[PDB]
Design a binder for this molecule. Structure first.
Ligand code: HEM
Ligand code: HEM
Lengths: 210, 206
């Protein structure tokens, strides 16, 4: 789904009043906006602030994504939501929201976009599990095969190998490596500056990714 | 999101023409509709048949959910899509789909529904992965803490001890453990006392 820019609808004659009537609510920092076994429900839109959406397990907490000014979310996703700041949100029950959406279909894209954000986040988390090891292995490879340049502008860790050269070395398939590596590149652990040429920003973090 | 009934839109004067213009394509059984790296892009709606949406990973596949008549989906999810039987889809490019959605907003709920279904499927898949991992943890735990005697090999630890040592919660491990029990790989003969029938089976899980 495309990303959604809510000002487009709020500034439009049609969407301008969308939230008229929505109650307002404030969440103190560190407070749980909602969690499983939740007896609450409804829909809200962040006015300002920041909320974290996640799941937990394996001694580790999986941060899915964040909610900031303009983002919409519900109280029944089975996800945990906490304020990492004092955040204000407009609130309303599902029905009211559905009514408003049908009266102003263009606002629907906000929902579409956040469902997409939530989805890819999860895919990423699933991807991190189906490849936990190959990624540490490749993080090992990059550590063991890295070489630096003179600090006199200056200082850059490099690893010049092509995905196939890498795949051959570590063993795993070429397509599996590509995903693992592409995964690591997302996390910013490894930068790609052309085919067969990479760079390692901050080697201490990559070391931590192994 | 709510469930979506596409007939509702298609039978309405406004939505009746929604797909008027989409091309048609028959996907043979076993056929791969979407490759993890297909590169081309567009949106389709299943006419009839059934498609599988899965992800590959470290020599092994995991099924997320299936598409059947009325379901819409895209060619850029990143997920692989194979047909589990002769399936017919109506496809078009993103541009065309978005244009149609613009003039027929009500059909957007179909997009919203598939996204919710995929979201839901993924959250279930994540829960499965982690539950599967904690089990192996408890599996390997029983391996490195076996009291082979008389032969009646065993393990003398309460649920809270295994949990703490495992680096998990008394509740978490407890449900993963009892799972390992129902399946006959460990037997709980009293608090803090378990026996390991067949050690190779347990050492297999790990
Ligand atoms: C029909 C079901 C659809 C599904 C389930 C879906 C799924 C996805 C997923 C999973 C992503 C993340 C890509 C990644 O893994 O990196 C995404 C991105 C994207 N999708 Fe869709 N999509 C759909 C429909 C659409 C439509 C209708 C449009 C456009 C009107 C669209 C436009 C995009 C764009 C622009 C991106 C990349 C930019 C971004 O959002 O960050 N998608 N989509
Ligand atoms: C604001 C974004 C929203 C998100 C993130 C979202 C997410 C979800 C998720 C994950 C579920 C499955 C829960 C489970 O079974 O564990 C669900 C179910 C449901 N949602 Fe939403 N939802 C949103 C908004 C809404 C809205 C606006 C409505 C009303 C139009 C709604 C109506 C429902 C209903 C009725 C169910 C049950 C449908 C089913 O089981 O397929 N949701 N939602």
């Amino acid at each position: 789904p495309p990303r959604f820019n809510i000002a487009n609808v709020l500034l439009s004659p049609d969407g301008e009043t969308f939230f008229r009537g929505f109650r307002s609510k404030i969440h103190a920092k560190g407070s749980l906006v909602c969690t499983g076994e939740g007896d609450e429900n409804g829909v809200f839109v962040v006015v300002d602030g920041r909320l974290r959406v996640y799941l937990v397990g394996e001694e580790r907490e999986i941060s899915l994504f964040y909610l900031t000014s303009g983002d919409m979310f519900c109280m029944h996703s089975g996800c945990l939501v906490e304020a990492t700041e004092r955040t204000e949100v407009r609130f309303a029950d599902i029905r009211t929201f559905e009514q408003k959406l049908q009266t102003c279909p263009s606002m629907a894209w906000g929902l579409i976009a956040i469902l997409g954000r939530a989805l890819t986040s999860c895919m990423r988390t699933i991807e991190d599990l189906m490849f936990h090891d190959i990624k540490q292995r490749i993080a090992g490879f990059f550590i063991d095969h890295a070489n630096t340049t003179g600090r006199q502008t200056g200082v850059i860790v490099s690893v010049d190998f092509t995905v196939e050269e890498i795949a051959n070395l570590i063993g795993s398939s070429r397509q599996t490596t590509s995903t693992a590596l592409n995964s690591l590149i997302k996390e910013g652990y490894i930068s790609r500056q052309g085919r067969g040429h990479y760079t390692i920003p901050n080697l201490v973090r990559l070391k931590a990714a192994a």
